[PDB]
């Protein structure tokens, strides 16, 4: 019997299949790391939001400014504070400027859960 | 990968939209993604040669040679785009074809599990249903 | 009118050539533009000027082989020459930020007149002025008084020329009354935002902008007169100018409401080649496009504007007066005052005008026969 | 006739397979008609690919030219 079809399922494969093919000496295109994100954000697994940017910076590409506040801010939607923290960790690493609001706003939820 | 044989660029090949085949088959198809920012569209007509006439022209034209690229090796044309959402739908509806395929050829169950497999083109009724496809062996016992 | 070669620039031989024949027919006064490449190759070098007039510097003219301050420094030149205080005259305008530099170039002792729109320390400037689709009211200060000038040119850009036409009366002590009646004589100024009037209630300017920059300066003024719609045709040249196609395309598409892209000058080039290249600035492709007409369809841009195309300039500049409504603006950009349409090595004869001109006469007989041209497709009263 | 040669120099062979081979599909997922029409699109594909893996343009089924036979041959013609 074929599986069905679920956005998880769909996501878990691109991950996949962008691993193999950096790994195998193709560079997918800053398009297609943002159309593999833009299914997650449609699909809540905020679980996967942190190796989809993980590979996105590790090919030199940086989102806009408010492609990284839609992220923040669905993970706030759903509770998900857990990979927002990590997420801004990760943007502070690789040093890209980080908008006042949404730091305002991930402080915030930091002291709102304690 | 256990070839040591890398991805050649034919294969990594990109469309207008900027996409390849690690995101070509995620369901909304031939369209680009926010990316956070406007487009730079004359950053791409420069780097497509634009500036030099060695630009690609998406301009149809009268004779028997497609215009997209990912044409080529192809003796009829590329493949249609099928994205793996409807891959799925469709492989889901052609299994339970076969299923309401071979029930035919052998009581209110039966009425309750026939209609319920031309709704899908009860459940657990229609899960004891087994396709034989490929089974030579067991092809050879009804042929005896 | 003298049958002038089709020349940008004339050679200094022409130029003294044309000059004399002037006098010899009765010619006691005249008027040359001095442009920065003439001044800077010499060619105006032995003319003898009385009067020097200086507009603005803009770092517009890519053309120009030479650095910001070689440009500035060509225009000098003009200047340098005001020696004679008896017979010379200096008219600049101070709104511009470099007209210091002008003013202390040549003889300081030169009587200089100065005029601007913004800047009211200038002898000319204007007291309250008019803009609508059709004509420009001005009321301008003089040192000799104030006038009231009514005139055919349009735009913000065209009161600094009628000032400094005015300090040029003032400064050759020309009377009030001449100024006004010379000024106000002058209507279109060919392909220079030229108004096409044929009575109707739209207007209809042709503009020689070819350029990204000139584009937008050309449509920002426009703007400024407050249309309900604008309408521009713009195509470019082929086998050159190949980086300014997708530019052209994304800069009308943002100003202007409706855009239909045209062949300016195709050459050699397939027409349809370099409208791709232009659309490539909106990010789409002529493929697409043409999707879009089997569909009897065109969407709108993601700002709500227009775009459509057409490949033959005749039917695209008339389709365009076609789509003009009540207090709309139709801009056709490009050629301007320019009478040929290259295709291939030949030079057909086309004018621009003469198209706006005849669509205007014959929009009215289409309307009434039921056509709905209000934008592409056509739906005809036998078409659903 | 010269406004079938425009449609037959114009026509996207490719295309014309990709939307025969769906739409033979729809009928089958749904009497005299429907097995015709079926029929048809089938020879429809068939014929579209002969046209792309030959050197034969469909346009030459309307006569630009016509060849007039050699004399000796028409000594009713």
């Known amino acids: 019997t074929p599986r069905r079809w679920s956005q998880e399922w769909e996501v878990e494969l691109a991950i996949v299949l962008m691993a193999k093919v950096i790994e195998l000496g193709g560079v997918p295109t800053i398009g297609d790391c943002a159309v593999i994100l833009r299914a997650a954000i449609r699909a809540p697994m905020p679980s996967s939001f942190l190796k989809i940017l993980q590979t996105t910076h590790s090919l030199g590409y940086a989102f806009g400014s408010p492609l990284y506040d839609e992220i923040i801010t669905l993970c706030l939607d759903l509770g998900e504070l857990d990979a927002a923290i990590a997420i801004v960790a990760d943007m502070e690493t690789t040093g890209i400027t980080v908008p006042d609001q949404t730091l305002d706003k991930v402080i915030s939820a930091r002291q709102s859960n304690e | ?144 | 009118k003298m049958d002038s070669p089709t020349t940008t620039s004339p050679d200094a031989v022409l130029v003294q050539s044309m000059m004399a024949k002037m006098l010899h027919n009765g010619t006691e006064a005249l008027v040359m533009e001095a442009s920065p490449q003439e001044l800077a190759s010499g060619k105006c070098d032995e003319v003898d000027f009385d009067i020097a007039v200086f507009t603005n510097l803009t770092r517009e003219d890519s053309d120009f082989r030479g650095t910001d301050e070689e440009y500035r420094d060509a225009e000098a030149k003009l200047f340098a020459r005001m020696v004679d205080p008896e017979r010379h005259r200096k008219v600049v305008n101070i709104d511009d930020p470099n007209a210091a530099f002008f003013v202390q170039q040549g003889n300081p002792d030169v009587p200089v007149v100065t005029f601007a729109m913004e800047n009211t320390k200038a002898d000319v400037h204007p007291l309250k002025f008019e803009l609508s689709l059709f004509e420009t009211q001005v009321l301008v200060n003089t040192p000799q008084g104030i006038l009231e000038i009514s005139s055919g040119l349009l735009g913000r850009h065209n009161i600094y020329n009628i000032l400094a036409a005015v300090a040029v009366g003032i400064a050759v002590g020309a009377p009030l009354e001449d100024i006004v009646r010379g000024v106000e004589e002058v209507d279109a100024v060919p392909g220079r935002c030229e108004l096409i009037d044929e009575e109707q209630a739209f207007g209809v300017i042709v503009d020689h902008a070819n350029t990204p920059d000139g584009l937008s300066r050309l449509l920002d003024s426009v703007r400024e007169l407050k249309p309900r719609r604008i309408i521009t045709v713009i195509g470019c040249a082929g086998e050159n100018e190949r980086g300014k196609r997708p530019v052209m395309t994304k800069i009308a598409t943002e100003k202007s409401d409706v855009t239909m892209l045209t062949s300016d000058n195709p050459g050699n080039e397939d027409p349809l080649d370099i409208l791709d290249d232009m659309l490539s600035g909106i990010g789409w492709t002529m493929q697409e496009y043409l999707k879009h007409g089997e569909h009897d369809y065109y969407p709108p841009l993601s700002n709500g504007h227009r775009l459509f195309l057409h490949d033959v300039r005749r039917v695209a500049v008339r389709c365009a007066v076609a789509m003009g409504e009540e207090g709309d603006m139709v801009v056709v950009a490009g050629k301007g005052h320019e009478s040929y349409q290259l295709e291939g090595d030949k030079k057909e004869f086309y004018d621009d005008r003469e198209e706006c001109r005849e669509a205007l006469q014959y929009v009215d007989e289409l309307h009434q026969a039921g056509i709905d041209t209000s934008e592409f497709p056509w739906r005809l009263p036998e078409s659903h | 006739a010269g406004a079938i040669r425009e449609q037959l120099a114009d026509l996207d062979l490719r295309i014309i397979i990709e939307n025969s081979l769906v739409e033979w599909k729809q009928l089958g997922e749904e009497d005299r008609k429907i097995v015709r029409r079926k029929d048809f699109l089938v020879r429809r594909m068939e014929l579209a690919k002969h046209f792309i893996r030959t050197n034969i343009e469909p346009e030459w089924m309307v006569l630009c030219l016509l060849p007039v036979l050699p004399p000796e041959l028409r000594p009713d013609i």
């Open chain 2, 1 to 144: 990968r256990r070839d040591n044989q890398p991805i050649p660029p034919r294969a990594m090949i990109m469309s207008r939209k900027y996409r390849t085949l690690v995101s070509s088959w995620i369901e909304p198809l031939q369209e680009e993604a926010e990316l956070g920012y406007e487009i730079d569209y004359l950053a791409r007509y420069v780097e497509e040669g634009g500036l030099t006439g060695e630009r690609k022209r998406w301009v149809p034209r009268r004779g028997k040679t497609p215009l997209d690229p990912d044409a080529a090796g192809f003796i009829y044309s590329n493949p249609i785009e099928t994205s793996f959402k409807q891959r799925c739908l469709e492989d889901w509806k052609v299994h339970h074809r076969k299923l309401l395929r071979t029930l035919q050829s052998e009581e209110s169950d039966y009425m309750r599990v026939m209609e319920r497999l031309r709704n899908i083109i009860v459940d657990e009724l229609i899960c004891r249903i087994k396709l034989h496809e490929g089974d030579t062996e067991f092809w050879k016992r009804r042929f005896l």
